[PDB]
Ligand binder design. Sequence first.
Ligand SMILES: *[C@@H]1O[C@H](CO)[C@@H](O[C@@H]2O[C@H](CO)[C@@H](O)[C@H](O)[C@H]2NC(C)=O)[C@H](O)[C@H]1NC(C)=O
Length: 264
Amino acid sequence: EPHSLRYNLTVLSWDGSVQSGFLTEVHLDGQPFLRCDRQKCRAKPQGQWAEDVLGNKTWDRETRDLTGNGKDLRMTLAHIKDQKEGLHSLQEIRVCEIHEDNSTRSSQHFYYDGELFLSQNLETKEWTMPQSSRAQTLAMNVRNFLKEDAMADCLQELRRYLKSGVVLRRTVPPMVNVTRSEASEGNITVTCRASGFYPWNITLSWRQDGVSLSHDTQQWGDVLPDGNGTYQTWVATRICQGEEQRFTCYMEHSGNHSTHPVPS
Ligand SMILES: *[C@@H]1O[C@H](CO)[C@@H](O[C@@H]2O[C@H](CO)[C@@H](O)[C@H](O)[C@H]2NC(C)=O)[C@H](O)[C@H]1NC(C)=O
């Protein structure tokens, strides 16, 4: 289950002058989350979703920081020169996703009157101009100023919302446990069990000397319902003498994997 957070800040400038107002569009995991004034953040669908659980958090912390960046961009715009007559806008879309990889990505993009003219990879800080060119000056304008004023928080936030239950994570890792069935001549029966996981597509299987056992050598348990809406299942094969050293159970679930050996 991948996740992402995106804030869309828009700012206006009428004939050079920069308006006092501005707005932020926030989408959590690709869904309308909040909308923010200069003095308020209103929850959206997911906005409420959350609203219940914690109460109001999609208020304070947020509204505070968003306004700031707003007032900040307000300047960033004021800064640009060739402000032709009319109503114009400058948008800064900060994006950041958390891939299955558990790996991260966080960028930020700038648009003039809707046209993307400059973007940057917040992680590696690489600037980039799209397929057009003369937006360069604009890009330069912005770029420079940004630097001048100089003379994390997204993912921070994403992680937060995530961990705080704002978004209902929908994947539960299984519990693997290898057990042996004391034995005689045909020898023992090691059994690999996976429980309490969700969703249902899981991969259980034994491996002797690294190589996967054939479908037959092992016995399979159906994928059945387990605790709190989870599932559970199992796999076993007949091991001989003291050869467990070579046997290992392998399990895969929604992209995650792990190997378990035979107890002593
Ligand atoms: C980012 O935010 C702005 C404001 O919500 C979006 O810009 C508007 O989008 C619609 C469709 O293009 C236009 O009719 C409006 O005139 C646009 N400008 C403004 C100032 O509202 C923008 O499309 C949003 N989404 C993205 C991906 O940038």
